[model samples]
Target: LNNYLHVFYYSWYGNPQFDGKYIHWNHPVLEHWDPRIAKNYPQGRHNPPDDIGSSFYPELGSYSSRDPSVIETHMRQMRSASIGVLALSWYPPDVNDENGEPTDNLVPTILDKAHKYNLKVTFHIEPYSNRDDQNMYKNVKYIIDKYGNHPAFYRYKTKTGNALPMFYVYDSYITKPEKWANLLTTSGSRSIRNSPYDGLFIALLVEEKHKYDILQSGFDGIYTYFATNGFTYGSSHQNWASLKLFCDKYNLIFIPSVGPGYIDTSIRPWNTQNTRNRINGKYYEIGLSAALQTRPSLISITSFNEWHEGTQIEKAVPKRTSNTVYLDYRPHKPGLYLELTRKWSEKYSKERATYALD
Candidate 1:
């Protein structure tokens, strides 16, 4: 396998300037809302530096995901950072989150732009309402049928020399192992083993128990999604080595997720314990170090722009609103994260080469 750095990407953003009106920007304050997030932005819409939908303010401020310029710039930034794949967060065409509208139409645009930058796109299948194994089977078939032919669609080559598309199943634990096994296992009742839709289905690993479940479910691999250190057994960097050992024994891929920092206080203000400081990029370096120690076949960054969680590696600038102050890459330029990512990407590639030789 080639050295790969895949970043989680969200395309659910919207703005009145380009999208006619705000989608996620006008987040509700009451419905299952965290008061802390509501408190961060008193107004419905999050402005820049002070009032923003995300904990960390983006350099481009609150821009619409539909904007071609923003998409182009993002692809360029990822290319510059040596990121090979984007695990794009996706919901079904008629399905969407409470905060945002349908964004399935944007996938083609994202794919087309990513190809120009020599980047690959993979699906991070989000758990929408009523997402079951049967639905997943249909979803996979739909994705493959619609965008599978795109050049930018990411495909992982298996040991048997079969190159199949890859998918990251977010919150996969929600489905019963038996349900997943039916679709993923070769001998299962509805298996897609030899079908065109057969691909590497990676399940999210939240707790240590999830590993056993993934094995039972016939998942190809596991990925830790959270950026917080001690939030979960899988999210903790210290447990990755042992996890890698487990994956090795079971012949499953262990994809460790690293991030610069985590701060979702904007939305979940009460959830302050998980907020991690970037320490002027040292935090990111440490996470990368831990991931490299595992010698993983694929390393995933928590996000390229999960601004709500403050785990984004996208450029952010210093800005202060009338009441609140936004976080930025102070003491360094806005492009510091990208530069750091590029540096580590080169190092990761070199180490992989050495490991291959060994």
Candidate 2:
């Protein structure tokens, strides 16, 4: 596995100026029974500052992901932060969640812009309805046929020294191990083994017992996606070393995900216990430090623009609502997270070099 830093990214946002329609930005404020939340906004959707859909406000405000300027700035920022790869969220063409429209069309532009900054792009396959082994096979073929050759497309080098496209199967546990084995296992029926579409497939590790299941499914690696520590065994920093040891024994890659913070009170108003404060960046540093101690070949960041979850490292500014105030970097500038990311990325690289030499 390549020792690289990858950030989870989403390009589903839209605005009238670029997409001629609103996508996720216009999220309606939920009419919860809590008067403080419902009465202040009265309407759901992020309008920024006074009435926003997120616990924090974006420094760039609610912006369109379709705009070339936004994509350019994102690439520049990721590059500046020393991120080597972007794990872009993807749904099949003609399919998307209730909040956003289809964004597969944006991959080409992402590839073009990412290449300019010497960054790479990987796919984080979302769970679209009716997704099965057969359909997944088709999706793999479609992606490889369409964007596999892009200069910025990410590839992982296997122990055999062969480089192949890498894919992150989100919520992979939803599919039974038997079903995934058909596609991922070398000896299973309908296996993609030795096929052009065959690549490094990483499954989401949500439960402690899922380790054995992942091995049975023939996945190449495991990634913990939750930003809030203690949310699950895979997400807690304390468990990463043991997970790494298991992966090492099995020859599977272990990619620990770190985030600056987490707070989705804007969306799930009832889930305040999971809210994690950034502590002016100390939280992020602690997460990074834990990940490094595991000595994994790769590290994945929770998000670049998952603002609704408030896990984004993208710049955010201070703003006040009629009933409450939003979080911000405060004493530090908006780019503080970016700067810290750069610092840790260099440190990670240095550590990897020493590990290799040793």
Candidate 3:
């Protein structure tokens, strides 16, 4: 099994039937950066089953993330895609992004459900409320203390053979490197290194200078999270090869994240420039090819069910809302993304084996 293939996941979607009210599905249409441009675009919360927040309509139709059936179906979808790990996007117990509620209550269910499908779960820690080096140490300890015992919690073997828990710290650059160093470095105060809670930490790579900061901060690895290609220096395809070289020299894991496409204009209407059309699946293939050429240790798919950003590989069907028509895999099946992903995953496995022998 190619256990290195990880897909970003979100578990905060809620429907009226399960949680008594809609959560992320009823996302409000965001105003433009300028008030002048904002008045020109439509605004307000989307009603479910027909008018949802995404550019692509899900086959499940605004399903609740808490629903056991929804998670089971998602696991089956991941298995078919040959993806092994679910890099779950997380916020603190009472904290969440503006459009959603906290989902720490849902992790145990996700862990239990994921294990049934031969899948592993890893934390993708978001920059939550009061996120800093001091609070980060507490949060990591909290997570490890709670979920570390679960059989499905993923651990990675480092060169020194320490099978430590892994975490992807999203937007890690916000905290200064010196502050991170105190937590990550062995000799610094509040360090988790060599402690019971110690784990491999992966930082989000956004700016070019973050490569240096990541190393100085003592992060074990780096990953690009944007589904929009070239939105940042790290997510840009051309930079991945050199990034791999940089990682190799520093003994850091280079996980180049790729996506099918991106279209978040449904939320932020003025952000059309960032939209990346799937181009009949060709765009996704190119991103995968670029990562493969670098011969890195792992690859990250931008998402499996982050439908809000239009990067989800979870099944989406063609549909029309009262006000807008959503994108779908027309002239193709709803599972086209899965088939394409599995195809690339097979190639990635074969290439890695060949390179190992070389």
Candidate 4:
């Protein structure tokens, strides 16, 4: 939600968030198989790139970058700093769900553990099922009914009473705008006029016309969903300005999103129109500038770990062997970009920097 920050994880095998409990392992699917020495390490430098990627080349399997260990690692950092809550990738049971909603069986325990560590949780549902209203109602309701009243149930808008939970509306395939609005409005509450519900509606797509029509039809807000998926293709500030005009005209809250690039080509292999290096730099500049300019209620990093697309901040399992030395500062990692953007944002807040176009 708007008031809370977010982080994600790749595993749930154990309560890995505890300080001394975290563990890391590089699977031996592609190499000198080791059935004996696969135990937790206390020290020793780990060459993840060599261990993970190069072993299995053409037959590339999913190397878990944001693996459970990594998630626990980051969550541990946030926890140590007294931060609370993380908007994790959750899945919805419907076709429209964004493939990242939490399982009902896992919901109670996750909330319980998070609350114990003073953290709240939100779900980032993906393009799941394209089910009918009846199915949508069931999927949405299931999550609400299960975790609606939990203390850690996260809300993004309106600091009011009983902010049940937050969910991302990741798909708009219904085509009928009113149907979408009515379904969302009618499915959650019956009266809909003076209800106890408090949450935000984050639409999946980021088209101005479509967003305007959706708001006109009575959705609370719209999300700029064009963050990086694979390689860098920056979003247009001019287009964002147009959308902002509509937001200003209609008085809808807008939360902007940013992504470094998209890379899950195994599922959807496609190159963006702008694929060259200079173009990629421009894309980064624009997206970063837009990120600073919009300063929306909530700023979402497109992803921290979407390794299938190589867009993840985590290092890649390299194409070299144990002797192949990789640089300490690799250009592909998103961590550097994230740090740079945060620094730029800090500077922008202090004073605007001019770009030389003349």
Candidate 5:
């Protein structure tokens, strides 16, 4: 992974239950129909964040909404825009009825197409609720055995073992939903950072109030902590400061997370307070500038089609607005976004001394 390229966490897998079946493939989004999704996703689907209209967003074409072609179109635009590779999400084996079947047959197809444009592929594991390691490995081995050998498969350190194809383990936060609920029910808070919960007797005390103790925890020093009442909507420089500071603190590499904005409460509406305002390109660049100062290694465009939470970057036509997209669906210039991407590749080439100058 070079400074010019990034592996965004795209794609997702969900759990499915089958009658008379002890084991079933976890294919949530794949299972539901269009309007059906609206049942769980009240706000309904919009264009993805990456779909910035026709030229930059063939991903939004009517022919889209399905796989293979959709995946192909995305890969084409990425290659055209000089995106080095995709960090597509995948499921481990045993999670499905087919056991070790690879979910996205599009992987091989996309890889073949990418070859024509010179691009690469990587896998981003999607987290499912509470599964044993045995089942997980079924999916893992299937992928590794299938495309791990492909030349275009993403690698970290050249030919050496140093850079194996990137297979990011999903974050631990979403391990088992049932188990999570159980823990929350049973667990009680303790002192300060680990404070105890009141039995609905009164307003609960916030742990962060014990700032001195939090700072002593060490992790606090690295984080640009701020105060807020959970998630809210609207624009604010305060919201994105942590991103900027985090980059500066450790000189960390930045992978931008693009989203049309957040809304929709169908899945976990009670917990869904993070319905932030749509991110205009101006605001996006403002946030990017802070990280770019550190000379971001790559910008992981948050997503191309994470339409569930309404974070999709694709161009969309909303019901309320006839032609207007809910987001600022304008490009930087006349093909400048695409041109800059290509130029970025050329400018940030391995041979260029300036590529590493910063």
Candidate 6:
């Protein structure tokens, strides 16, 4: 069984059937830099059921993230994928991304459902508006005090034998390392280090320098979250071996995230350069091979579902609407990605065991 695989998950999606209206499914079309080019693209909120804001149509359609049945389905899918934990995208209470509403309320539902399947949950702290180190400390405390007791709350068991809550801070570069030091470092004035709340905190690795910055900030690990293999220095699979070497030298955990593919042109029509085709699952296979070759302690999946960016591994189906046609697996089944994940996850587990003896 896969015990070290983590998948990034989202909870902001909502449908009229469950939340009175569509949330992220009805994403607003972003304006392009060139007016002439922008004129050709459609602008407005996407209407769900037929015209959702995703390149691929989901097998469950435009479903609400809150529905018990949907949560049940997601849990089953995660279990089938052999994923051990989900790093749920989170925000401070009452805060949310521009395209969605407050999603903090759904954590309980995710925790409960994840636990039902013997899965675990970790936090993926987003760079919310007005976020700072001080407030970051309080929110981390709030999250732990509130949800830490839950059976599904993930506690990473490090080599030191300390099982601590794990948090993945996305876009960690927005704040300076000195600021993060206040919360993560033991010597800082507001350090959480010696407290019961002290845990394994992972920072986003984007630029090459952020590795040193994250280390100086007292972060426990580094994770490359973007699915595009070459979008950033961190996301490139070629860098994993070196990144892992760096992490090993520093005694830090290295989590290399891989995705099935990326195609967000439906949501960001103007940004086609970053689109990466699935290539009949070959792309995902290559990424998995690259990640496993590094012999890291853990690997994270870019997403279980982040439809807006089209990095989802969740099942998707073929669909056509009047104004648009959606992409799908076509000759392949909707569950192809899930099967691939399971296969690679099993392989990863075996490889980790083999490396352990070394």
lDDT of each: 0.87, 0.88, 0.91, 0.45, 0.40, 0.91
Clash count per candidate = 1, 7, 0, 28, 26, 0
In candidate 6, what are the lDDT values of residues 1-358, reduced to their tens digit? Answer: 4769999999999988899998998998988988899889988888877888899989998999999989889989999999989999999999998888999999999999999999999999999987878998899899999999999999887677988999999998899889999898988979999898899889899999888898888898999999998899999999999999999999999999999889887778988888999998999999999999999999999989999888899999988777677888778999999999999999999888888754
lDDT of 2 by residue, 21-105 (tens): 6667666655668777666544556663356567778877778887888888998889888998999999999899667899898
Off by over 4 Å in 2: 1-3, 28-50, 158-161, 321-324
Give candidate 6 regions above 4 Å deviation: 33-37, 159-161
- lDDT score of residue 120 within candidate 2: 91
User: Mind giving the per-residue lDDT tens digits that candidate 3 earns over 250-324?
Assistant: 999999999999999888888898999999899999999999999989999998988878999899998975667
Decoy 6 TM-score against native? 0.97
How far off is model 6, as Cα RMSD? 1.4
For candidate 4, lDDT tens digit of each residue in 1-358?
A: 1133343323222112332222222222222134242232122322343332221121112332223444344444435423344655555532222222233345565666666566677776554545444555555667667777787666653445545466566555344565555555644333132344334555554444576567634566666545452321214445656555666677765555555554332222233342222133345556557755754444454444443333333333334455644222244432444444445444443432242223
Q: Candidates ranked by TM-score, best first?
A: 3, 6, 1, 2, 4, 5
Looking at model 1, report the run of 10 residues with the lowest lDDT sum: 41-50
**Ranking 1 against 2 by TM-score, winner:** 1
Task: Report the C-alpha displacement of residue 189, candidate 3, in angstroms.
Answer: 0.6
What TM-score number comes out for model 2? 0.93
Which should have the higher TM-score, number 1 or number 4?
A: 1
